[PDB]
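Q: Could you fold this chain for me?
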Amino acid sequence: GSRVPSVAGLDVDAARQRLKDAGFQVADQTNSVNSSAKYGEVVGTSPSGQTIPGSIVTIQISNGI
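A: Sure. Below is the predicted structure, expressed as structure tokens.
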């Protein structure tokens, strides 16, 4: 089922649990970017909305604190 859940604004730990719930996988390499948001919050990810399982999904957060 190609339909990745939206975790934007949530925590990484939560976004990781969602993927596993949909039968998705989590990548080990992560990217952090500076912004006016709270570090640890997922604001940028590889997949968008509906994504098909089989590729690499990287979770990126915005560090502002």
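A (continued): The CA atoms of residues 30 and 36 lie 19 Å apart.
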